[PDB]
Structure formats: structure tokens, C-alpha cells
Steps between C-alpha positions, in 0.01 A plus 500: 500500500531165324733516201523129417158508332326800346128438539390832348697409188329159486152650533571769242645248255203263529251781439707631208524161329127438509432853374736426211297190416182712488680742267593209272139382480381850411765529229393170346139621484591838351738353242254240373179701535329196657377458857558122498846397380587185697295234673438630850375850425141378447453129428128502419540835328764343275280196436200712405722727290639203306148367444397845377807511273390167354151645451635820339722316251218258424246777444735678258570180305128415498419840353759431228330162441164675466645737239641207300161328514337819373752501214406144405128585507551812287701303242231231475220754456699687237540178304125431519426844349628394155290183506190704577572735209552207261173336605309827453642521147394140426148571626472797264618274217234242595230769491617606155528145363140416593370738233370337184670726244828309533594193298705202620822660375444818704427289807824309442691829485339575836602156628862577408503792744308297758759221483784749545327661800425165666864407454602826667272423796670161538845658471414743780385210716812292442754784522380737776758485777608651831848409627508194270163381636213433262177668610211439258541127428322385816806424712345697790134416434257398772510127427858510374713200595815675376573780748352766728563872542537652848602851606662521843364835613582471870813488716410163655477133415151439358404849379450435130215519250434293189441641152321310222548573130275309262585345161471739204636279220238535223370157600364619834342787302341248258671658199677170427331162488601175664679382185661841449245629249451876498186699555378562146337801335484353149119468488225739603342234722830431675584870529168551678583233759852637547353822644382320814827311541691827477263654755572213740875540442473871579306418818775262613773755424312770692455272802873424502580872482262565790675234714849648431369852581358375830840342583684827413259706719548263794877516451489882502313502831747247640800708391360809673429300816851352496659844464298637792583193710871534424498866608322422828722200576818697433373773732441241775841337454689829502304611807634184665860475376618845385683730740375850573824685430412808710434304819813295435708818466361625832602174669842502331579854614394424857717188513803679351479776763475232770810332356696826514392566859593147606842529336566825687395335827726197441794732430422685823476176697832365369696796643317497834726266707804720430412716802625230737855552371507833688513297823812310387 
């Protein structure tokens, strides 16, 4: 028997060392909870998982963007409500002032209230704000040269939609003249004409409210779609990258038992060449 080199020991040690490496890989997977932990486990799986992680984060942020856009739309519509109420009041005043039982003084007392209400309309237009951005002055109107409003409702580069808000500044509603003169109710003839102007102003306000409602409804549908997409994408990504802990435990137990058996065999092989010493 050759005692200068123990070949059974060499074989047992090689097998044991590579079994220990398999044990280490299993432990890494079980500790992290992820099937792919270093480059080499699954290269394309890792690439697709990182792309899906990008998509998941983007979908979540885009849903948050959609909610913020809905908040802006709701604020704008709420501000338009007061203008509508004021214009309805002014129309009732115009109906009343057209009657012939009033004198010029009574019509001027009506014009006092009309002037105050027109001023309040203008104040709403110049002061309505969302995150320090003016809304009703025409900054985001269709032909506006000032700025544009876009809501980025997707997780990718060009997935955005434009929102238009028209001018509601008591000049677009024809309640103020070119030179700044107010709509007047001081005569019965002028009160009669003011009824049609107020009707037109109400029509414009209603159209603006309809546009903002359409935007809000679209944004609601988009938010639901984004939530569903995020759930499905996360399911796909986890199906790719997450470790099944039960299967991993099965593998880990098998490899540990193999390690123990190999250690016992290496211990047995180390003591084997001692039997030659009986011949000496």
C-alpha cells in the first residue's frame, strides 16, 4: 500500500469542498430571500428583473403623479364653483332691475352690489392657486404663450397628457369692458341686455367645469389602470427573482447531509494508511 500519497483523502476532500460551496450558495439564497443574488445565477433573469423593478417603481410614482393631478383638477373646479354662484346672483339682480317700478336710485343701489360681486369674481381669478401656480388667469390656456400643464401618468419617457384651463378673469366672461368699465345694471334697458351677457358667462363657466370633470374622470381610470399594472408587474418580477423558501430549505438540508457524510468519509480515509505500520 502506498503511504506517500493518500488518494482516497484527495478524492474525499475535493468532493467535500465543492459540496461546501453548494451549501454556501443555498445559505445566501435563504438568508436574502432572493433567487438571484450575484451576477452569474441568472444573467437574463437579473436583467429582466431589474427592468421590471424600474417598471414597478415607475408605475407607483406615476400613480402618485395621477393623484396629484386629480388634486389640482379638484382645486380648480372648487374655485370655479364660487364664480358660478356669483354669476347666478348677478343674473337674478339683472332680472329684478329690468322691472319698471324702480327709480334710478334703486338701480344704483343694485349696481353697488353688482360692482362688489364683479370685484369678487376678479379676485377669485387673480388669487386662485395650487402650489403657488395661478390657474384661472389663462397661464395654461389653449393659445397661452406663458406655460403648459402636463401630467406624467406613465412610467416611461413620453407618457404624459396635457391639460388646458381657460381664462376666467371677468374680462373673458365679458363682465368687464376693454377700458375696465363694469357691466352695468343702472338702467332698465341695460339691465335687460345684461341678462344675455350673464347667460353667456354661465355657459362659459359650465363648459370649463365640464372639461375639468372629463379630465378628473380620465385620471381616475388611469389611476385604476396603473394600480392594476403595478400589481401584475410586481407579481411577474417576484416570480422571476424571489426565492421559494421551501424548495431552498429542501436543497439546503440535502447539501448539509452530504457535507456531514463527506466529512465522515474524509476522516475514515485519513486513518486508512495506518494499517501498513503493522508490517513494520
